[PDB]
Amino acid sequence: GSELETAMETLINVFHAHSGKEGDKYKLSKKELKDLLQTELSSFLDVQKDADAVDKIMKELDENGDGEVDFQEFVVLVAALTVACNNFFWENS
Amino acid sequence: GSELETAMETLINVFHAHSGKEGDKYKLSKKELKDLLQTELSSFLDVQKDADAVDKIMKELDENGDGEVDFQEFVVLVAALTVACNNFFWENS
């Protein structure tokens, strides 16, 4: 019910959008989850900032893109990318 | 504009709610940020799962609660707590 608490519930519902395959509710194998957000956050390409942070995250998905990611992995890894493009000016319009 | 992209924009606006002090937009010192979410996620106390994950996160805020946290720190640390209470049954009603 709180503003921050409300955000937590919304994230779980959207995860179902991609993971709702009903098979693996997880955020899928690391190789796929990256294809989904790396493209969904297209505005991310609008202005990359720290290539070192993005570079490390890409290391886990490329070393074993067959690994796995779930809610804590989707949130921690996606927030980590935000470091590399945390630019608030990354507005697409 | 996408469902996952929309969640990213909403999180920044609520951070302003607590951090909007206008001084430090960061998520504040680690000691305070924990007081805010540890209480806001009250349903978290509804059913703690892995005390080891929560225990490690508490280590950073207790070793130097005077440290600092920002957007990537608030998202990665708060998602990390979700590991300790990821219980979907943690419904308060």
From Swiss-Prot, chains A, B:
GO cellular component, one term: I band
SS bond list: none
Cellular compartments annotated: Cytoplasm; Sarcoplasmic reticulum; Mitochondrion
One Pfam family named in its UniProt record: EF-hand_1
Modified residues (S-nitrosocysteine): C85
Keyword Ion transport found: no
Residue sites binding Ca(2+) 1 per the record: K27, E32
GO biological process, one term: regulation of heart contraction
The UniProt record lists the keyword Calcium: yes
EF-hand domain boundaries: 12-47, 49-84
Binding-site positions, Ca(2+) 2: D62, N64, D66, E68, E73
Tissues in which the protein is found: Although predominant among the water-soluble brain proteins, S100 is also found in a variety of other tissues.
Keywords: Calcium, Cytoplasm, Metal-binding, Mitochondrion, Repeat, S-nitrosylation, Sarcoplasmic reticulum
Broad class of where this protein is predominantly found: cytoplasm
UniProt PTM: Glutathionylated; glutathionylation increases affinity to calcium about 10-fold.
One function term, GO molecular function aspect: S100 protein binding
PANTHER family cross-referenced by the UniProt entry: PROTEIN S100-A1-RELATED, S100 CALCIUM-BINDING PROTEIN
Description of how the protein assembles with itself and partners: Dimer of either two alpha chains, or two beta chains, or one alpha and one beta chain. Also forms heterodimers with S100P. Interacts with AGER. Interacts with CAPZA1. Interacts with FKBP4. Interacts with RYR1 and RYR2. Interacts with CACYBP in a calcium-dependent manner. Interacts with PPP5C (via TPR repeats); the interaction is calcium-dependent and modulates PPP5C activity. Interacts with ATP2A2 and PLN in a Ca(2+)-dependent manner. Interacts with mitochondrial F1-ATPase subunits ATP5F1A and ATP5F1B; these interactions increase F1-ATPase activity.
Protein's job: Small calcium binding protein that plays important roles in several biological processes such as Ca(2+) homeostasis, chondrocyte biology and cardiomyocyte regulation. In response to an increase in intracellular Ca(2+) levels, binds calcium which triggers conformational changes. These changes allow interactions with specific target proteins and modulate their activity.
Other facts: Able to bind zinc in vitro; the binding sites are different from the calcium binding sites. The physiological relevance of zinc binding is unclear. Physiological concentrations of potassium antagonize the binding of both divalent cations, especially affecting the high-affinity calcium-binding sites.
Protein name: Protein S100-A1
Organism, scientific name: Rattus norvegicus
